[model samples]
Target: AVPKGRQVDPHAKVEIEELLGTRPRQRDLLIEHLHLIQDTYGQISADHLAALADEMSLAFAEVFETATFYAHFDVVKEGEADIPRLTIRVCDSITCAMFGADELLETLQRELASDAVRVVRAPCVGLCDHAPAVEVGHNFLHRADLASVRAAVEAEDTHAHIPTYVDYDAYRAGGGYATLERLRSGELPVDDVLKVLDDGGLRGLGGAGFPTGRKWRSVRGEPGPRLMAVNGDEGEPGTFKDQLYLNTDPHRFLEGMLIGAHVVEAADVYIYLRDEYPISREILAREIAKLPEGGTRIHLRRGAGAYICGEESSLIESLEGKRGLPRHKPPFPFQVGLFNRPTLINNIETLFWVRDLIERGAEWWKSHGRNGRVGLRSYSVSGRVKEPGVKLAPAGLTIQELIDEYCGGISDGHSFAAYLPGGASGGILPASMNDIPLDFGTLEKYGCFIGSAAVVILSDQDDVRGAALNLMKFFEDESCGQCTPCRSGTQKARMLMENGVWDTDLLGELAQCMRDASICGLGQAASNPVSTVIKYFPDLF
Candidate 1:
C-alpha cells in the first residue's frame, strides 16, 4: 500500500528537516538527512521517531521498529558515548585491539588538529584479513597508518559513488532502469537476461557459491505466484559487507531485485533482513516505497536475531510467519517455496552484481577473474592486519596478496597464525598456505571455502581450540533443531569444545553425522570450522 501524503509524523519530519537542513528533491538529501540526523541526534532513535509518528497519526510502531533494525544506528546506552570516536572505531574487536588499536587511536588524535573525523567503533566489519581498520562513509580505508588516516580525512570523495544516494535523474543518466526499460519494451527476453548473468558468471555471495544464472533459469520456468527473496540477513558473525551494501548502496540492490523479479516473472520480491540491521531495513523500506510502479512489488521482512534464518529455507519459513527452520530438500525452493510457489533466493551482494551485469554486458562483467571464477569479490579482511575493512579484489588473488598488499600485511611485530578464509563456518587455513589463491576452486582444494568472502584472521596469541569452540558454540545456540544431525550433533560438538579436550575421533565422528545427516546447510556447513581447525591446527589442540 502506498503511504499517504505526510504519512510520516509531522513533528518527527520537522525535526528531521530542521536537523538535516532544507529537504532537497534528490536522493542525496535522504542520505544527507540520515547522516545529519546521526550527527545531530548522535544517532537515529526509533523511540523518539515513533513518538513523533504517533503524534502525526502515522503507523508509529512500524516506523519506529524499522528505525532501530540496522547496524549503522547509534543505539548506545547513556554514558557510553565518551569514548572518543577516533579512539573507539579504529580497533578491530578481539583481534587487532590486542596489539594496539587504542594506541593507534591516540597517535591519530595527536596527528590531527581536531577530532573533526570521529571514530564510531563497532563489531567486525567482516574484514578480518585487515584488522585495525576504520570505515568512513561508503569507503573503508584500511591499513590505517598515520599517513593513511590523514589521507582518509583529507580525501575529497569519502563516500563511494553509490547510485541510491544520487538523484533519480542522475541515476537514470547513469544507466539506472535501463534493464527495466528494455524489459518493458520487450527488447530483452527473460532467457537472454539470464544468459547475460550466466556469461557474466554471477555467483551467489551468500556463501553457497551457487551460480546465479542456474538459480534464475530453474525458477524462471516454474509456475506463477513465484517469489524472489533478497537475502539481506547476513548473520555470519564476522560478515558485514551485505550490511554496508544495503546501508550505503541500497538503490543498486533494489534495482537488482527489480531485474531479478522481471527475469523470473516473480509476482513479488522480499528483502529478508536481520533485525539488528535496523538502519538498513528502515532505509530499504523508504527506498522501496519510492520505486517505480508496474513492476514487481518489493516487501521487507525482518529477521528475529536468528542466525539460522540466513539459510534460504529457514528464511522462507520465517517469512511465512513460522519458526526459522530449514525444510527438508527434494522439494527444493525452486519447486515449492514461499506458499508452495517456486522461488529464487539471492544474497544482497549477488543481486548488486546482477544489476551490474544487466547494465554492463556479460563480457564486461566477466572480464575480471580467471578459471571457473569470474568477477571481483568483496572481501572483509579483519584480525591482526594493519588495515582492516572491505575491498574489491579479483577472485584468484592469493591470500598472501590480500594480506601483504591489499591489507598492508599484519600489524607491526605480529606474525600471522591462522586464518578462516570464510566466516566461522569456513574451514581454518594455516599460515603455511597463505599464498593459496582465494577463489572457490583453490579453497575447495584445501578443504576450505571462500564462503561469503569473509576472511577472519587470527594472531599467534589467539587460542585456536578456544576460538573453534566459541564458533561451534554459536552454531549450537543458533541451530533450528529441526533435524537430529544438527540438533544433537551440534550440542555434542559444543560439549567437546567446551571441555577443552580435543579428541580427533570425537570430532571426526561428529563431523560425519553433521555432513551426512544434516537436513540442510546449517548443520552440515557449520561443522567446517571445527573440522578444519582440528585437521590443520592439530598441534594447537
Candidate 2:
C-alpha cells in the first residue's frame, strides 16, 4: 500500500497557482478548486491534479478520489484523449426515453461522429416537463431535436437561456422581504412562526416528507451557532419543482429561507444547487448578491452532478468539498453536520412556501386539501399529460382527479395506463389504483409514497417493463458506491431485471435485501421499481 508519489508538473503548477490567485488554499475548497480548473480546461488533466493536490497540501490520492466520485468532472491521464470540445448530454431518463431520447441520442452520435464532438446519455437533467432534453455545455435545449442541437453546437452557444424571474427589485416592491424583516426584528415571535408551520401541516416536499415545524424546532433546540442548507438538488428523475420555483420566483424562496434562518437563529445559510440547473444557478447567484444586509450570511454551493447529494448527510459532505456519501445515523445533520455544527436542512420548495404560510395563516393553508390530508403540494407532473409541468395543487388529490382537473387529461391519442406517484424512487401504480390520494403517507399502504409529489403519468403507448428497467438503470448508475447492498445490489438487480422472464423469487429476495440493508434512501428505495412491477404488472414478465 505504497503511494504512487507522482511528480507535479512545473508548468501546471504555475497555471494552477495563477488561476487560484490569492484564494485561501483550504482543504475543504477541493471541489471548488476542481470546478475552477475543470470549467476552464474542460478536463482535469493529471498534471493539474498533481499541482492542485500539492498546492492545497492534500494527498494526491485524496484529490483524485474526490474528483472521480462525481459524474460531471472528467479526470484525464496524460496520454488519454482530452475531453471533446462540445459535449452534448442527452437525458435518457424514463420521461425522456418515452419521448424518443434514445433515437435522438443515436441520431446525434451517428451524425456528429467527430473527435471534437461527443454525445453521451445522461440521467434526468431536471427537465421532465420538456422530455428529450439535451444539455450542450451549460446551455439546455427544451424538446431538443437534431436540428436545434446542431444549431446550438454550430453557433458554439453554450450560454444558458436565463428565464425572466421576478428579480429582487420586483420582489421587494411586492412586500416580499417585509415578513422576513418582521421575523428578524422580533416584531413577529418565533413561537408564532412555529405555530403557523405546525398548524399549516407543512412537511418537507423533498422525498422525506418530515414535518417542517418539528425539524425547525429540533434544530433550534440544538446548541448554536447553527447552519442552514436548502436542498435545491432536485435530481429525482421526474422532479423539477425546485427549478420551477427558482426560475419563476426566486425571491420568494429566498425570503422564506431567510425567515427560516431567523427563526432558527442560524449563523449561516448554504444552498447546494444541482449542477444541471444552469439557469437556477445563475439566477440564484445574481439574486443572492443583491440581498440586503442581514444577521446571517448566505453561501451558494454547486453540486457536481450526483443524485445522492440530495440526501441531507451526503449534501453536508459535498458542502465540505468531499465525496457526497450518505452518513450513518445516531448523529444526524441536526446534531452533527457541516463543519461539525447543528444544521437545519430543508428542501427548496419547503422554504418557498414559508412567507405565504405565515402571511396567510395556518388554517387557511390547511384548508386547501381534499381527502383527510391538508396543505398544498407542488406536484411535478409529466408524461402522457396534455400539460406537463409543475402543478400547485392541494395535497391528497387522487391521480385520476389530478389528471382530469389539473392536467388536461391524458395526451391526445394516449389513454392513461399507470403513473409514478413520486419521482423515480416512488413505486409505480396501475391506473386501476388511480383513485388513491396522492400524498405523503397515503400511497404507503400500496407500497408507494408520493415523495416530493412528483407525479409522472403513463399512457397505454408506454412500456411498463421498459420504464421500470430504465429507472433501475438510473438507480444503478447514480448509486454512491459506499455500501455493498446499494452498490452491488443495484447492479445485480438491474441485470436480473433485463431478462425477458424475470427470476421473480430471486428478485423478491434481492429487493428485500436492498430494502433491509442499504444505507440511505437512494439504495434502500432502489428496488421500488422492480418490486412494483412484480406486484402490480406481473404480466410484463
Estimated TM-score for each candidate: 0.72, 0.98
Residues 177-228, model 1: lDDT tens digits: 7877788677987778888888887788888878999998888778777888
lDDT of 1 at 461: 72
Give each model's whole-structure lDDT. 0.69, 0.89
- Quote the positional error of residue 106 for candidate 1 in Å: 24
Error of 1 at 253 (Å): 1.2
Cα RMSD of all models vs. native, in order, equals 9.2, 1.2
lDDT of 2: 0.89
Model 1: what TM-score? 0.72
Model 2 segments beyond 4 Å from truth?
1-4
